[PDB]
Amino acid sequence: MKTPITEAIASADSQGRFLSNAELQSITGRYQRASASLEAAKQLTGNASRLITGAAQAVYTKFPFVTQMPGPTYASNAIGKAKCARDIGYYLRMTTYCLVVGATGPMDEYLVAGLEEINRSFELSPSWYIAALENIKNDHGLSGQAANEANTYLDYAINVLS
Amino acid sequence: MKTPITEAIASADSQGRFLSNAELQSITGRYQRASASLEAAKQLTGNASRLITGAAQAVYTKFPFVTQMPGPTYASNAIGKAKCARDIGYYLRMTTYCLVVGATGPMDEYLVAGLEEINRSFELSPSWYIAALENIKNDHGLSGQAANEANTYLDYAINVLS
Amino acid sequence: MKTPITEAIASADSQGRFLSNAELQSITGRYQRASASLEAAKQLTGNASRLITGAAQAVYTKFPFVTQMPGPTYASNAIGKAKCARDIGYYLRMTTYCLVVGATGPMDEYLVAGLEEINRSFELSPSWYIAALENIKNDHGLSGQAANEANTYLDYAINVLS
Amino acid sequence: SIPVLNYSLSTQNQRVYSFEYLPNEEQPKCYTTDNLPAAIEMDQIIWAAYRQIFSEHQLLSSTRQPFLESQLRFNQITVKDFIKGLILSDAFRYLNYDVNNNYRFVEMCIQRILGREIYNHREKLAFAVIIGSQGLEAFIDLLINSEEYEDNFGDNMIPYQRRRIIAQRSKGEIPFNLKTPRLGKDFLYKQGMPQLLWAGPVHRFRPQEQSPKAGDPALFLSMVQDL
Amino acid sequence: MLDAFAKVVAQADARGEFLSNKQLNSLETMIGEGNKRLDIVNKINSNASTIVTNSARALFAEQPQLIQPGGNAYTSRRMAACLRDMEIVLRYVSYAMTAGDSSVLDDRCLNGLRETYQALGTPGTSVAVAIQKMKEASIALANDLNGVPLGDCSSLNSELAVYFDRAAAAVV
Amino acid sequence: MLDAFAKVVAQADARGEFLSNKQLNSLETMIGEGNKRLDIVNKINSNASTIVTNSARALFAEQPQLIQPGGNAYTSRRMAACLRDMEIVLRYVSYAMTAGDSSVLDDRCLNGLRETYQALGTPGTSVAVAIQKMKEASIALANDLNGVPLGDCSSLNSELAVYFDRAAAAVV
Amino acid sequence: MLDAFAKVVAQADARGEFLSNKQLNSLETMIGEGNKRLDIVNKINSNASTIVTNSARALFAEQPQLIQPGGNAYTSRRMAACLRDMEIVLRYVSYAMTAGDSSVLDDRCLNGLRETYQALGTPGTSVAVAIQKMKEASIALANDLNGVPLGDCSSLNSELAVYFDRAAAAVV
Amino acid sequence: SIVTKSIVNADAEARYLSPGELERIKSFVLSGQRRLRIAQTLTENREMIVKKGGQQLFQKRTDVVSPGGNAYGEEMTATCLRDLDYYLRLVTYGIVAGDVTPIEEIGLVGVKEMYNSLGTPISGVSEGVRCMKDVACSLLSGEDSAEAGFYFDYTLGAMQ
Ligand SMILES: C=CC1=C(C)[C@@H](Cc2[nH]c(/C=C3N=C(/C=C4\NC(=O)[C@H](C)[C@H]4CC)C(C)=C\3CCC(=O)O)c(CCC(=O)O)c2C)NC1=O
Ligand SMILES: C=CC1=C(C)[C@@H](Cc2[nH]c(/C=C3N=C(/C=C4\NC(=O)[C@H](C)[C@H]4CC)C(C)=C\3CCC(=O)O)c(CCC(=O)O)c2C)NC1=O
Ligand SMILES: C=CC1=C(C)[C@@H](Cc2[nH]c(/C=C3N=C(/C=C4\NC(=O)[C@H](C)[C@H]4CC)C(C)=C\3CCC(=O)O)c(CCC(=O)O)c2C)NC1=O
Ligand SMILES: C=CC1=C(C)[C@@H](Cc2[nH]c(/C=C3N=C(/C=C4\NC(=O)[C@H](C)[C@H]4CC)C(C)=C\3CCC(=O)O)c(CCC(=O)O)c2C)NC1=O
Ligand SMILES: C=CC1=C(C)[C@@H](Cc2[nH]c(/C=C3N=C(/C=C4\NC(=O)[C@H](C)[C@H]4CC)C(C)=C\3CCC(=O)O)c(CCC(=O)O)c2C)NC1=O
Ligand SMILES: C=CC1=C(C)[C@@H](Cc2[nH]c(/C=C3N=C(/C=C4\NC(=O)[C@H](C)[C@H]4CC)C(C)=C\3CCC(=O)O)c(CCC(=O)O)c2C)NC1=O
Ligand SMILES: C=CC1=C(C)[C@@H](Cc2[nH]c(/C=C3N=C(/C=C4\NC(=O)[C@H](C)[C@H]4CC)C(C)=C\3CCC(=O)O)c(CCC(=O)O)c2C)NC1=O
Ligand SMILES: C=CC1=C(C)[C@@H](Cc2[nH]c(/C=C3N=C(/C=C4\NC(=O)[C@H](C)[C@H]4CC)C(C)=C\3CCC(=O)O)c(CCC(=O)O)c2C)NC1=O
Ligand SMILES: C=CC1=C(C)[C@@H](Cc2[nH]c(/C=C3N=C(/C=C4\NC(=O)[C@H](C)[C@H]4CC)C(C)=C\3CCC(=O)O)c(CCC(=O)O)c2C)NC1=O
Ligand SMILES: C=CC1=C(C)[C@@H](Cc2[nH]c(/C=C3N=C(/C=C4\NC(=O)[C@H](C)[C@H]4CC)C(C)=C\3CCC(=O)O)c(CCC(=O)O)c2C)NC1=O
Ligand SMILES: CCC1=C(C)/C(=C/C2=NC(=C\c3[nH]c(/C=C4\NC(=O)[C@H](C)[C@H]4CC)c(C)c3CCC(=O)O)/C(CCC(=O)O)=C2C)NC1=O
């Protein structure tokens, strides 16, 4: 998985080389941001539930047709609502992982790769989740550097779906 | 030139990718060590002369045949002494560069590449320079983390010549 | 451009080969279906206008939020509504091209390649156009083999967008 | 069977020993199958090979090959066979082959697979004959089974641009996909030249009176800002 | 590559129009005559080797320059390269006879070729004489009333002679 | 490739000297302001898609040439190529914003490129207008006083505008 | 690709004749002296590194430009590139000394020296001085009356100084 | 100018200026500030008139910027807009002069011989000046753009 650490060891390994002072400086810089990263990671875990329910609700309010169309894909059933909260839950989970790891490696591994084929075969628009993530980016409640750590990744997923 | 910075740019260039948060953490870590790096860099420039002279003198005291061997390659002339101090001057220069840049990139570019073929074609001995660098490593007079920043690179050149 | 003809010539070119009996059989088979293909091609061109306007109307009736959503990407403007009929006109155009040529080569060249990146970067839902093509497929008014020649390619575009 | 004619030979960078003990940078990442990479690093190899042949522009979803990926990830082929079956894939033929004037497709093959510029014009001549008769297949067979390609990439490595940047100097050589882009200078000439290119000239307008003349101080301004 | 059809569609799309009924009617006429075209291409392919070698005999018989030493037919490798180049040009004339439009013949073979037989010191005028030795033979086999029902094919032989004249005009 | 540092050390070694005290002190000032630099590059990357697509909307809205059928945005495929070229130039401007020196932007992207958009018949003047549509947007997101403490960033914003002006000056 | 023999055979066949008795007799004389040629190539190979390094000492001693910073011998890596390029040109002179004809020297090493250097900002005139430092030493070891009994080899030293002068004339 | 035309007129009649012509000079010198306002506005709005008039020209007339056209290419289009800039400048000169003499002698005397020697369709030039007339009438008042617009109309009558 792409961490800063595995990235630096991978590069120095590909150059057939010991870890010089450069890569050790990089790992240092991972450690001296990691505290803000974990403060951001604990508050997201600390109120993950309400972020999900509020996110799905915001998606419903912006797109009123989703709760009204008589189709399997749309959240007009008792199933698409649960599955709607399921998917939003997945994204919030991955963001918390990337805040712990320190790069976008977990989201790029477990989530980003192959997502076009899912959203193409199951007729799901890119925006729905965009709207969800915009609500989470507006209402995570972090402050300062922890908020930069969260908004980086939450913006990043929006850059993926757009 | 291999910096931390150009390393990060180079890796995310090879992945066809923007800079994420990982690379920025690396650049952070370069900046948060750079002050001790410059304290180390200023004092070596501040007394580089006496380090050179002391170093060449130590090379002579360890290897007494050098000042006595009749040859082109040996400092028994008035030429190999000045050229001896010339090369020692070069090593110390490259160490001060690497302390400013923050990796071994200047030494790997300007000094390390192809040096075995020079020391093979010109009958030069790796140990001579090894002895010089040992004296510099013993007598630079830095203290604390600046001394670790000097001794890292000074050791690194010894790892190259051995 | 992929025709039947350039397919056969391309294969026999890659084999370093004259046109044998096989490719001549292929071009025969193109000639003996081309009549129905052109009958289908004439009627679509003959009333393309009402097909476009009916199609955009059907997209509006299925998706009423599109005519109501304030944004640049939605047909709530005079301009948004105008563009909509532009793109539906493009789909009908490419189907008439493929009916004339006898393969999906004009649609695969001019239309299909890179379509995901457009519908990802400009937030265009795959379904809108799906609904448009469903109306075209239901209301072209052909009969018999001409209708199969139209519905092959009209189905084909839906297989592309899904 | 009429072998390839004897051609000349030039002197480029790829035939010297830049010893470079302990590589600075710029050494193209070793994206292979030898290091037993997991799922991600497999995806990075797959993307790096795609960029290499197709390049960034032709790496779109329609162009992408699922099946040779699924075979490669499972060990059913070598990377060399992946690069080969890549070039034989027809989406590469509709774009980069049907456009290119036969002598020019020889550039992008000897140059996108071997990572070196052509020695002289005669090379383009000979290799364009063998792709003109045997087909694209046996030409790519010639390049891949060649002694050169086995000598430096072996069985599982994505080809790279060899020695693009000399030690220390920044400039070096222009990147490869940049160098031979696709369309070509004279390909259009035979058809209608691209119509309706005027508006870019309209959006940018300078009065003739504003334009610098010889001997003014302003012409040298750029030099002053670089010092 | 482009056939007869994709040229019309390529122009029409490059201007961004539908095909009018007039273009469709003429295109119906082309489809209604396509059998004759396949017949000619059959009669070329099934005699193609013989065409090439007989035109080679004629060429070297009338110009005894090239084989007697110093010329380009002299070396065995060159002699064989010469023959197969004649086969190449015949191959692309057969392709452009099927496709209807001089498209595959004008980008893969002819375009750049005159430049190539000036990098090798080869007389492209002698190449044009070789193509003039293939045109006569090819038309002479095209007009064989044998195995095929009677009809009118002058309007298509006038479409075959154009390509052979275009190659001879383009290597010089 | 060279950053801020390696340029100074490359000049100093190319003359073969130590670094004087004056160079070290200015270099200390650059290190002492480097958080702002990281902040800008963070605010570009995390909005990069939006920058690209909004500048594309502006571009094709103001010049409706390109997407009409005979232009370069017309082909759906060409259209995608157009967009991702904008993404590319934005990527290298972000790299050269981090490194401080226009080194990676002047060898890997801009060098050779004006030659390339003359081999494709692409209006490079229109490309420079696209870059002028990205500069505006990128600086307008760079100067967002939001989540970031208050302070002075004109000395850096100006530096940012250098690179976008350099790409526009170099594709034309 | 053509030794001294294959050039004569190539001329004779290019005219398409038998080899006349005059060519055969001179060729007999060449074979009758070819042991001395092998002896000289032995005396070059077995001292080649020493030749190179001694001519390098001479070069940098006479022109102190190159090593003091700003020149081309100043970089450690560039220093070694200087030496190796001298090794390259000595290698190909050894090749063309064995073959008798400047064929391998005129296609494998001669073609890329002028173009590459002027692209490296290297004084090719100084390269030619390096080759003039190698010609002296190489002939001085070729004329070593040691280990081999005496004979006449000025006739063959002329044949060796041609190649060294050809490389010096061709990097400039 | 009007002064030049009157002086030349009574000069060839070898007399002083009549009262009718001196009243004409009075009306001219009192109408001055209005003229200078108009040429001031067309001066400071030149890039809008050249750009927008060039857009309406090339959109109405896709001949000359098509392949094989007189202006096909970046350099040629730039030269085309350069000439529209020239005729805009000359219209402003004719406005401050109060007479078409500045326009005629700088720009119109032997224009057809020049553009016929360049291969340029002069009807395209007249359509360009008409396009700049539409833009410049969009930038002014009623009577104001009547006056200036009629200077443009003189230039169109000289091209056609
Ligand atoms: C690892 C990451 C990961 C994800 C992010 C999800 C993404 C995802 N969602 C669905 C599938 C689904 N996702 C939704 C969600 C939606 N309902 C709506 O009203 C909204 C538009 C939207 C929530 C915002 C629905 C309704 C389905 C079922 C669609 C259907 O069957 O019609 C599927 C297909 C398989 C399935 O049915 O579950 C996948 C892969 N799955 C993953 O493995
Ligand atoms: C940038 C990095 C850099 C280096 C690492 C040196 C390496 C180097 N040293 C020498 C050359 C030399 N180096 C020395 C140095 C000395 N020999 C002794 O016996 C003493 C112990 C020792 C001084 C302490 C001497 C005397 C020579 C000249 C003769 C020789 O080869 O020994 C040369 C050949 C050119 C010359 O004569 O100057 C080179 C490339 N030069 C560089 O530019
Ligand atoms: C009463 C007299 C008296 C002394 C003379 C000191 C001496 C002393 N210093 C350290 C220990 C130390 N002393 C220093 C000081 C510094 N190291 C650097 O590199 C800087 C240049 C320098 C500050 C200017 C440091 C950093 C340590 C801990 C690590 C080390 O050994 O360097 C220790 C070990 C115990 C400890 O970690 O504190 C002792 C005994 N202590 C005393 O009580
Ligand atoms: C060659 C084929 C080809 C196509 C098929 C189109 C596809 C396409 N449409 C748009 C762009 C667009 N397409 C639409 C169309 C829509 N309006 C709606 O209300 C509906 C959902 C939908 C019609 C059914 C709109 C509104 C835009 C502009 C979107 C925006 O700027 O917000 C763009 C981006 C460039 C532009 O702005 O024009 C592209 C590539 N273009 C091509 O070159
Ligand atoms: C697709 C289009 C296409 C072409 C236009 C040719 C062009 C071409 N011809 C040759 C190569 C050649 N072409 C010929 C042909 C002949 N030389 C003579 O003196 C005769 C007059 C003449 C036959 C009539 C010969 C003999 C060679 C090999 C030697 C030479 O260069 O002359 C080569 C070099 C490769 C090779 O040796 O085959 C190329 C690229 N090849 C193609 O694939
Ligand atoms: C796969 C390969 C393949 C071929 C090579 C053709 C061969 C072929 N030609 C015809 C049929 C025909 N072919 C010709 C052609 C001719 N007109 C003349 O003046 C000339 C003598 C000659 C062209 C050189 C004509 C005129 C007919 C119709 C004959 C008739 O109905 O009288 C038929 C009978 C079916 C039909 O009417 O089309 C067939 C099988 N068909 C194939 O499937
Ligand atoms: C490393 C740096 C780097 C770049 C900067 C690009 C530059 C570049 N662009 C293209 C290619 C292209 N670039 C564009 C872009 C354009 N579309 C338009 O409407 C505008 C004029 C313009 C965007 C502003 C298009 C449309 C193509 C495809 C052209 C075609 O095939 O007709 C190609 C040829 C290969 C390909 O098809 O992708 C190259 C090398 N590539 C690189 O490797
Ligand atoms: C790894 C990622 C990473 C980042 C993204 C930055 C984020 C960052 N910015 C600042 C700090 C700051 N950031 C800005 C930036 C600006 N303020 C303005 O009003 C302008 C809108 C904007 C122009 C760029 C300023 C002015 C400061 C405070 C001054 C300073 O610390 O130099 C700090 C200091 C600590 C703190 O404030 O708590 C940090 C860590 N650093 C990192 O390590
Ligand atoms: C396969 C490699 C190979 C070689 C390299 C030679 C080496 C060689 N040279 C000689 C023999 C000889 N070589 C020379 C050459 C010399 N004359 C001089 O003036 C110079 C010092 C020198 C040329 C530079 C002479 C003169 C003899 C004959 C010596 C004698 O008989 O006195 C002999 C003994 C057999 C003979 O008489 O030919 C051999 C083995 N032979 C080989 O088979
Ligand atoms: C097959 C034949 C063949 C050659 C003949 C060489 C020629 C050659 N030399 C260099 C490159 C070089 N060559 C030299 C040599 C010189 N140093 C000086 O002081 C002298 C002027 C001169 C020796 C006489 C140097 C110094 C470089 C590196 C130049 C630089 O990077 O600044 C390069 C560029 C690639 C590289 O850096 O190695 C090439 C192609 N290479 C080949 O493949
Ligand atoms: C002040 C009075 C004055 C005028 C007007 C003038 C015009 C003038 N127009 C020129 C060219 C040109 N002018 C045009 C103009 C056009 N092409 C079209 O299709 C359109 C109809 C039209 C633009 C509206 C073009 C295309 C050329 C260059 C043609 C060529 O060089 O092939 C040149 C040739 C060299 C040069 O420009 O420097 C002159 C001198 N010179 C003068 O002294």
mmCIF file of C-alpha atoms in Angstrom, chain G:
data_model
loop_
_atom_site.group_PDB
_atom_site.id
_atom_site.type_symbol
_atom_site.label_atom_id
_atom_site.label_comp_id
_atom_site.label_asym_id
_atom_site.label_seq_id
_atom_site.Cartn_x
_atom_site.Cartn_y
_atom_site.Cartn_z
ATOM 1 C CA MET G 1 31.913 -4.390 -42.296
ATOM 2 C CA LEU G 2 34.652 -4.531 -44.922
ATOM 3 C CA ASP G 3 38.274 -5.447 -44.172
ATOM 4 C CA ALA G 4 41.073 -4.706 -46.683
ATOM 5 C CA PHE G 5 40.110 -7.813 -48.664
ATOM 6 C CA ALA G 6 36.348 -7.359 -48.830
ATOM 7 C CA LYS G 7 36.783 -3.826 -50.134
ATOM 8 C CA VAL G 8 38.783 -5.158 -53.123
ATOM 9 C CA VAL G 9 36.250 -7.942 -53.650
ATOM 10 C CA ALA G 10 33.422 -5.466 -53.263
ATOM 11 C CA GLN G 11 34.901 -3.189 -55.957
ATOM 12 C CA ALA G 12 35.610 -6.115 -58.259
ATOM 13 C CA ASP G 13 32.112 -7.551 -57.910
ATOM 14 C CA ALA G 14 30.455 -4.152 -58.103
ATOM 15 C CA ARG G 15 32.027 -3.975 -61.528
ATOM 16 C CA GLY G 16 31.207 -7.675 -61.992
ATOM 17 C CA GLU G 17 34.507 -9.072 -63.056
ATOM 18 C CA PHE G 18 36.994 -11.712 -62.043
ATOM 19 C CA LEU G 19 39.932 -10.671 -59.958
ATOM 20 C CA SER G 20 42.786 -9.846 -62.273
ATOM 21 C CA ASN G 21 46.221 -11.268 -61.556
ATOM 22 C CA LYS G 22 47.545 -7.879 -60.484
ATOM 23 C CA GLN G 23 45.062 -7.536 -57.592
ATOM 24 C CA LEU G 24 45.814 -11.109 -56.458
ATOM 25 C CA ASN G 25 49.552 -10.501 -56.356
ATOM 26 C CA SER G 26 49.352 -7.354 -54.230
ATOM 27 C CA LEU G 27 46.925 -9.233 -52.009
ATOM 28 C CA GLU G 28 49.530 -11.996 -51.690
ATOM 29 C CA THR G 29 52.015 -9.362 -50.565
ATOM 30 C CA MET G 30 49.594 -8.108 -47.904
ATOM 31 C CA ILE G 31 49.142 -11.609 -46.530
ATOM 32 C CA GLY G 32 52.910 -12.035 -46.667
ATOM 33 C CA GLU G 33 53.357 -9.058 -44.319
ATOM 34 C CA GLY G 34 50.310 -9.479 -42.079
ATOM 35 C CA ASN G 35 52.258 -10.906 -39.127
ATOM 36 C CA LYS G 36 53.756 -7.508 -38.467
ATOM 37 C CA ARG G 37 50.198 -6.064 -38.381
ATOM 38 C CA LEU G 38 49.190 -8.600 -35.703
ATOM 39 C CA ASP G 39 52.341 -7.681 -33.797
ATOM 40 C CA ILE G 40 51.460 -3.953 -33.758
ATOM 41 C CA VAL G 41 47.881 -4.662 -32.661
ATOM 42 C CA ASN G 42 49.300 -6.838 -29.905
ATOM 43 C CA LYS G 43 51.564 -3.941 -28.839
ATOM 44 C CA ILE G 44 48.585 -1.529 -28.779
ATOM 45 C CA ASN G 45 46.137 -3.793 -26.839
ATOM 46 C CA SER G 46 48.592 -4.864 -24.259
ATOM 47 C CA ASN G 47 49.452 -1.257 -23.374
ATOM 48 C CA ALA G 48 46.177 0.477 -24.130
ATOM 49 C CA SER G 49 45.193 1.736 -20.665
ATOM 50 C CA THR G 50 48.678 3.106 -20.050
ATOM 51 C CA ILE G 51 48.581 4.901 -23.406
ATOM 52 C CA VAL G 52 45.283 6.505 -22.452
ATOM 53 C CA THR G 53 46.199 7.567 -18.932
ATOM 54 C CA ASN G 54 49.619 8.971 -19.935
ATOM 55 C CA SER G 55 48.124 10.971 -22.759
ATOM 56 C CA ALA G 56 45.530 12.204 -20.225
ATOM 57 C CA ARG G 57 48.282 13.422 -17.856
ATOM 58 C CA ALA G 58 49.902 15.190 -20.837
ATOM 59 C CA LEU G 59 46.567 16.679 -21.906
ATOM 60 C CA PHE G 60 45.585 18.186 -18.577
ATOM 61 C CA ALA G 61 49.167 19.275 -17.968
ATOM 62 C CA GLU G 62 49.417 21.220 -21.226
ATOM 63 C CA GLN G 63 45.903 22.605 -21.152
ATOM 64 C CA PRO G 64 45.046 23.485 -17.548
ATOM 65 C CA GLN G 65 41.669 24.775 -18.702
ATOM 66 C CA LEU G 66 39.733 21.600 -18.514
ATOM 67 C CA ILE G 67 40.080 20.548 -14.905
ATOM 68 C CA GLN G 68 39.888 23.929 -13.075
ATOM 69 C CA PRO G 69 36.150 24.570 -12.574
ATOM 70 C CA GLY G 70 34.057 25.438 -15.577
ATOM 71 C CA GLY G 71 35.972 23.169 -17.906
ATOM 72 C CA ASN G 72 35.116 19.650 -18.885
ATOM 73 C CA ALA G 73 37.509 17.665 -16.754
ATOM 74 C CA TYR G 74 36.343 19.495 -13.638
ATOM 75 C CA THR G 75 33.324 17.285 -12.866
ATOM 76 C CA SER G 76 34.437 13.923 -11.436
ATOM 77 C CA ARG G 77 31.996 12.103 -13.659
ATOM 78 C CA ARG G 78 32.868 14.351 -16.614
ATOM 79 C CA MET G 79 36.506 13.689 -15.955
ATOM 80 C CA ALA G 80 35.946 9.974 -16.286
ATOM 81 C CA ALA G 81 33.870 10.567 -19.483
ATOM 82 C CA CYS G 82 36.807 12.375 -20.952
ATOM 83 C CA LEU G 83 39.128 9.392 -20.260
ATOM 84 C CA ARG G 84 36.662 6.883 -21.601
ATOM 85 C CA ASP G 85 36.037 8.665 -24.733
ATOM 86 C CA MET G 86 39.781 8.545 -25.356
ATOM 87 C CA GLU G 87 39.517 4.746 -24.664
ATOM 88 C CA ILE G 88 36.743 4.507 -27.259
ATOM 89 C CA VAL G 89 38.642 6.168 -30.033
ATOM 90 C CA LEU G 90 41.743 4.055 -29.223
ATOM 91 C CA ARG G 91 39.538 0.948 -29.421
ATOM 92 C CA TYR G 92 38.305 1.711 -32.870
ATOM 93 C CA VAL G 93 41.713 2.663 -34.113
ATOM 94 C CA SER G 94 42.792 -0.841 -32.951
ATOM 95 C CA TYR G 95 39.893 -2.346 -34.882
ATOM 96 C CA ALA G 96 40.743 -0.436 -38.096
ATOM 97 C CA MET G 97 44.388 -1.352 -37.612
ATOM 98 C CA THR G 98 43.488 -5.018 -37.743
ATOM 99 C CA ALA G 99 41.047 -4.836 -40.617
ATOM 100 C CA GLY G 100 43.345 -2.765 -42.780
ATOM 101 C CA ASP G 101 40.477 -0.544 -43.959
ATOM 102 C CA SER G 102 38.840 2.441 -42.189
ATOM 103 C CA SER G 103 35.402 0.929 -42.319
ATOM 104 C CA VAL G 104 34.658 0.092 -38.686
ATOM 105 C CA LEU G 105 36.191 3.380 -37.644
ATOM 106 C CA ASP G 106 34.002 5.346 -40.142
ATOM 107 C CA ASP G 107 30.595 3.970 -39.162
ATOM 108 C CA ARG G 108 30.697 2.988 -35.516
ATOM 109 C CA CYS G 109 32.776 5.752 -33.879
ATOM 110 C CA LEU G 110 33.218 8.539 -36.456
ATOM 111 C CA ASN G 111 29.535 9.302 -37.131
ATOM 112 C CA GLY G 112 28.491 10.444 -33.658
ATOM 113 C CA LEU G 113 31.502 12.364 -32.378
ATOM 114 C CA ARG G 114 31.116 15.801 -33.969
ATOM 115 C CA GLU G 115 27.368 16.070 -33.499
ATOM 116 C CA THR G 116 27.325 14.958 -29.867
ATOM 117 C CA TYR G 117 30.191 17.156 -28.659
ATOM 118 C CA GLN G 118 28.843 20.390 -30.138
ATOM 119 C CA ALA G 119 25.743 19.414 -28.221
ATOM 120 C CA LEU G 120 27.775 19.040 -25.040
ATOM 121 C CA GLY G 121 29.674 22.343 -25.330
ATOM 122 C CA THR G 122 32.892 20.348 -25.587
ATOM 123 C CA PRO G 123 35.857 21.815 -27.527
ATOM 124 C CA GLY G 124 36.309 19.218 -30.282
ATOM 125 C CA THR G 125 39.589 20.849 -31.075
ATOM 126 C CA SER G 126 40.752 19.855 -27.623
ATOM 127 C CA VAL G 127 39.513 16.332 -28.411
ATOM 128 C CA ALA G 128 41.714 16.337 -31.484
ATOM 129 C CA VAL G 129 44.632 17.389 -29.261
ATOM 130 C CA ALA G 130 43.882 14.358 -27.080
ATOM 131 C CA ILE G 131 44.049 12.177 -30.113
ATOM 132 C CA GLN G 132 47.325 13.902 -31.033
ATOM 133 C CA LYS G 133 48.475 12.907 -27.567
ATOM 134 C CA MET G 134 47.582 9.328 -28.320
ATOM 135 C CA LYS G 135 49.119 9.144 -31.764
ATOM 136 C CA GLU G 136 52.622 9.965 -30.383
ATOM 137 C CA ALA G 137 52.468 7.335 -27.677
ATOM 138 C CA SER G 138 50.875 4.708 -29.862
ATOM 139 C CA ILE G 139 53.482 5.018 -32.600
ATOM 140 C CA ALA G 140 56.190 5.205 -29.938
ATOM 141 C CA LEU G 141 55.045 1.817 -28.671
ATOM 142 C CA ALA G 142 54.539 0.477 -32.141
ATOM 143 C CA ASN G 143 58.216 1.139 -32.899
ATOM 144 C CA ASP G 144 59.493 -0.669 -29.803
ATOM 145 C CA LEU G 145 62.392 -2.929 -30.800
ATOM 146 C CA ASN G 146 61.703 -5.331 -27.972
ATOM 147 C CA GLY G 147 60.651 -8.988 -27.852
ATOM 148 C CA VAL G 148 60.442 -9.219 -31.630
ATOM 149 C CA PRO G 149 63.401 -9.483 -34.038
ATOM 150 C CA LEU G 150 64.229 -6.529 -36.264
ATOM 151 C CA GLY G 151 62.536 -5.555 -39.516
ATOM 152 C CA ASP G 152 60.982 -2.750 -41.540
ATOM 153 C CA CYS G 153 57.658 -1.387 -40.373
ATOM 154 C CA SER G 154 57.650 2.293 -41.410
ATOM 155 C CA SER G 155 55.412 1.080 -44.290
ATOM 156 C CA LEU G 156 52.873 0.036 -41.679
ATOM 157 C CA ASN G 157 53.331 2.940 -39.237
ATOM 158 C CA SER G 158 52.207 5.183 -42.058
ATOM 159 C CA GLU G 159 49.175 2.942 -42.237
ATOM 160 C CA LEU G 160 48.600 3.478 -38.490
ATOM 161 C CA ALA G 161 49.076 7.256 -38.365
ATOM 162 C CA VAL G 162 46.359 7.603 -41.034
ATOM 163 C CA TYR G 163 43.623 6.447 -38.639
ATOM 164 C CA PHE G 164 44.714 8.622 -35.745
ATOM 165 C CA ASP G 165 44.833 11.604 -38.113
ATOM 166 C CA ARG G 166 41.395 10.641 -39.445
ATOM 167 C CA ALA G 167 39.787 10.689 -36.016
ATOM 168 C CA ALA G 168 41.463 14.024 -35.176
ATOM 169 C CA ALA G 169 40.227 15.363 -38.496
ATOM 170 C CA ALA G 170 36.732 14.030 -37.861
ATOM 171 C CA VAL G 171 35.962 15.297 -34.369
ATOM 172 C CA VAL G 172 36.742 18.771 -35.752
#
